[PDB]
Amino acid sequence: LINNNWGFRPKRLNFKLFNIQVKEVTDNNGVKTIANNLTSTVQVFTDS
Amino acid sequence: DGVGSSSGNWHCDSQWLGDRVITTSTRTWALPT
Amino acid sequence: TTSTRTWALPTYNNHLYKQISNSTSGGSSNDNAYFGYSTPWGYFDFNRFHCHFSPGFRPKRLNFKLFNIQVKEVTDNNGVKTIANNLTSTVQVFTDSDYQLPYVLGSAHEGCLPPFPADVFMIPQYGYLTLNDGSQAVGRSSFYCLEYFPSQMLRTGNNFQFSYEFENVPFHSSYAHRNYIPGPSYRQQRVSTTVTQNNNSEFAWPGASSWALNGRNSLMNPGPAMASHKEGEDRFFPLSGSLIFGKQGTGRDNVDADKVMITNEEEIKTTNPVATESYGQVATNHQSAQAQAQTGWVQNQGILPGMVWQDRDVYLQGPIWAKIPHTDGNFHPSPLMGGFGMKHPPPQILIKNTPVPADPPTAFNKDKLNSFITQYSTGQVSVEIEWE
Amino acid sequence: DGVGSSSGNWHCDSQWLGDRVITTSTRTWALPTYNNHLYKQISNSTSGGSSNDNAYFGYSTPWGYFDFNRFHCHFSPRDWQRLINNNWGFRPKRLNFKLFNIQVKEVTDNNGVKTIANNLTSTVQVFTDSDYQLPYVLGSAHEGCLPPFPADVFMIPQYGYLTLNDGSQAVGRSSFYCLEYFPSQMLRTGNNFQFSYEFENVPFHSSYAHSQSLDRLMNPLIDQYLYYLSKTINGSGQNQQTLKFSVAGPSNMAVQGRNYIPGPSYRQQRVSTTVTQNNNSEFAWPGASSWALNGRNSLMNPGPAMASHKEGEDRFFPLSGSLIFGKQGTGRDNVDADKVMITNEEEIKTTNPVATESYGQVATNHQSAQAQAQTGWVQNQGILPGMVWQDRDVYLQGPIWAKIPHTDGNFHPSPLMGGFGMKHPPPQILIKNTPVPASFITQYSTGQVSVEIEWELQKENSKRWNPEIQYTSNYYKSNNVEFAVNTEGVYSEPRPIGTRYLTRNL
Amino acid sequence: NVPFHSSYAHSQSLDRLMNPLIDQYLYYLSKTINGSGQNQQTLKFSVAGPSNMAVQGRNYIPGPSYRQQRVSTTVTQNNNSEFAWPGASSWALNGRNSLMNPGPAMASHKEGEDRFFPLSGSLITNEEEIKTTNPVATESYGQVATNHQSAQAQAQTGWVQNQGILPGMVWQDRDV
Amino acid sequence: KENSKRWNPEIQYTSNYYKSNNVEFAVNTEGVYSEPRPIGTRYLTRNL
Amino acid sequence: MKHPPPQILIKNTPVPADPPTAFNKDKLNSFITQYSTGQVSVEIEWE
Amino acid sequence: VQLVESGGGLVKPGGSLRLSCATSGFTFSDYYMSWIRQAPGKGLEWVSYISSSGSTIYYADSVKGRFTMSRDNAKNSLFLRMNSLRAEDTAVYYCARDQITVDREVIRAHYYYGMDVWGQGTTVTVS
Amino acid sequence: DIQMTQSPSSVSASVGDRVTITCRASQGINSYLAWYQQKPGKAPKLLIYAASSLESGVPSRFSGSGSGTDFTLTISSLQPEDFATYYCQQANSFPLTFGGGTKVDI
Ligand SMILES: [Ca+2]
């Protein structure tokens, strides 16, 4: 870009969120375990 | 969709075609509480 | 032909790309100096004949399938290890169909799909080399991040497939046989399987035929295609002339001669010179009344108009194809270890497990995550090939 | 069309469009009368012919010819930089030539002063040989090319050719060509001349350097399944013979089996830039690698394409292996080393042998309990099946094309001085002043010549993560700027510019 | 489909293809020492031109060679020994040595010597027509450097008896 | 796009060629990625 | 103005003197003494 | 362009001393570097010469076999390591660079035009 | 190795005078000669390189000529700044050697 151009500027943005995984960290005594929580959700919004 | 089906693919690429460049970046993130 | 195998893919380098060189392995020798990178990715190699064949011709079409993805997480508590399914994890796979990555499938490496269909094989780790000066790198050296290529991501229900069409190559000759003359020769040293006939000195490296490239000496292996020995002498084989296969269970270093299978290229005697023998003689002077006619031996001979030759034979254990390097010129591109030369060979198939980080801290830290869940994947791989 | 109407314009620009480049160059020329309108037999005898290697027989002609065969004729230093940084390959496609604005002149001399005037009725004969019937001298890398700087006015070189010789004498097979015996167009001050030429299909010149070496193509992480002979003895002592086979792997990369080998070599003698390392004797001619033809020795120049030196030895160069250009204003004979520019062929080290090194070793005997294993050095190696190589690089000052000599056979016709080999190259363009009899009137012509070439480009799709090596002007204060005129108006090319910067996988 | 047989003789030689009237723009190494005596070392460069035509850069080189022993039609010039078989160029195939006949296409003899002929390179027909692009069957193809020169060691050359194909070679086939 | 008529070559961002322990804009032996210097956008030239 | 009235460049095309009659490599430094004259007219519409 | 020598010190004969040259203002890899010393009240004397790459190094006969010249391209610096220092090694040591910049395309001697840029220098006294 | 000689060893002059310093080599060094001026407590400066070429920044008055064995350094219309020691070094071949030096004297 720098070597062969006098100028640049952004035009379009495209965003994607995918393959969400929600882990739960159950801890018993001094040992910590990680497992899938399949029913959990993730809240995501953009402020437009 | 479902637990055992991927909801997206990995897309890291740069395309040069005339006066336009299309950059694409995919990363892996971790979100705590 | 159609093959199906079961594979297991671990996590290499703990999701990291790492510079490697002979400084990392402690190798002092200059001929063995190298510079490169190791990648977290694995790759599939069916390039050996046994993968597609059980115990003239040429390939035509190719069909590859990757399915039954099973991703396992591993937890270790005290002595015991617990393995569990991770149903939401993905496995990444892509092919290089633009041939933009360094092509390591023509070097006769291991990690090929097992010849016996019930064997479960481990996918080999992908790495490449670049230009090096000693152990260091030069400014012409290139670094490749495979995460920079788009790839399909597969959970346990997803599958992957693609098909490839072999480019036109001549039929491999599988037969055994003035206006024409025999082909070129680059002489190999003659070693005898009866040890008492051999000189009592170490000549493995010192007496070997080599070629020098940028101050480094590469052994000539296997070398140009030449008959192993003259008719009637089966106890001699070229030092670097023929392909040597190990028997089942053969050790890594310094195995006895009975552990290896030394192939012979006896069939090509009809059109090719003997590897351990001089090509012929040439006049070294102008004779005269005072000067006798003198001759000298041709130890190495290049192409001459009117030469004919046979290529090197292929074996059940040998490689199938190679990638012709991209160069201004080449002659008779057929690879020297045997098989079909191709400018666009079957594309490399790259695979890795997508990293799943462990619990991140509750306060923001800018460093990349070095803590991950111990994890691996396994599945079924099928390759279908049409032969002519 | 008219005496007072111009027959052409000055078109001098380069257009970059997608995958192709169109270069257009216009220059101003002057054509003298050569040999006083005569064809004259020439030989080493006229030259004095001290040696048989320099013996020749031929003819000098009154005709001149146009030579645009150098890269600088059509490319500016900026255009060349644009091309070599952004592209893996290029090659010529079409050729458009124009000869216009003819101005014949008559020179009259009285006493000590010569007066020049227009001759409006004189003609200028121009023709091209498109059937290739005349000897082709454009592939010999001669002077008389269109000047790199467009503001320079250049003198057209005299045409001449050589035929079969015996010493200075000719033979019955020697040929004589009358260029008057060709049909040709005749141009007055209003006439113009143009033609179009189609380059025949050639491979793209490879403007890149490999990022891998032929011997490192392996996966560094994985063993081969091949074995090599590790040990021929168990240890020190009598009757220690044994056979031991290690597997080839990352630790030992030299022994591994490989599918391809580097290209052919014809060894050159190496000469160090620092002279006190050189031998105190005259070896320019006696130590040179040569080839003999019909009893005449010819230096091997530049020879097969090979690396100029090994890594870490920048000072050394092949004796006749590389292209050596002149700096601006350099004398003709016995110039100092600072005066010339010795090109470097290091970019091809990855796949080609070093010009000053042996190709390798071969076994010279059969070993036995009596006889040790003996290896000799390979000074020259012809083509072997399984070789790959790079052609010699092209330079901004270098030639573009050559004519493939018409023969029953050839191998890899790509010319040894670099560029594009062709069976039908751009045709020679011949020009002379039509004689005006007075014994003739002293006469010369002046003109405008324009040549346009279409170039095809090969872009890189490369996935390399780190930045490339690029050709760049150095940013530092200097009395002059590179590739520009000085205070006295003299354009100069300070350095040769290779074409290989970008990288590819091997 | 076959190529047309060539039934012509080149009117030019491979080394004379240059314009005799014009210098090259390329330099060669003319002089490695200033004068007689110790510690004289220097690199001088000259333009290749009409006066010296051996050092000019050329795009193409003559074809491959496999040398034949030179035999004279004048019996007293030849050596007084039986060298028909012993001094003949041959190739070995599976232990059996075969004489090289006629061999690669090469000029029978140099210009000016018609009494000599290749020992096994002649069908006695003359192949002198193809000398323009082809090396003489009884001559070495050329010289190569055999060593790295240095202040201690003189530059050493050696004769090329046989030369395989190189990129940039051109040659003529044998005449009918 | 840059459509300059400048005769002499530009200044271009380039990777230096010299033997070095690490490759610029690459990972080291430990796999750490690093950007060696800050790269500006201004190389090509224009008239004022 | 970002795009003002463009520069108009003019020179006399060099006409060389008699060449040396034997080929020389150098550019020609000997020219015929020359100059040119003409009529120039410029029209501008003002608002 | 600037060259700054450091690491000069007073040491007993047979001692080992390391000198450094920090360079700024020019590309380090484009030039060949040379150490030059000047004994007090005497003319300058050339010491060692190193290639841009650092692959090739030359030395004066007097300092040969005891002095090592090194080059670090990544962090611009030039180093001279002096072992077995003897009595007459006392000099002001100068860091200098060749006027001719290294050009990859051509093969030439870079020391023909001399050394245009010189550092202030570091004093070295042996006693 | 090649040795260099400068005559006179030292020279005294007034401002505006013309000063000539001459050094010659034991063996021919082509045109590869460099002239250096040094002031006490300071590093040497390159005035002339390759016999007749003047280093940038250096004043017009400084000049140089000669080839082969004999070389000459000329100062015309000498200034106050000009008084120092001058060294000539042959850059032909290793080891680089310097002349004894000439000290211009006020
Ligand atoms: Ca180059």
TrEMBL record, chain E:
It is found in: Virion. Belongs to the parvoviridae capsid protein family. This is Capsid protein VP1. It comes from Adeno-associated virus. The chain holds residues 419 to 612 of 736 of the full protein.
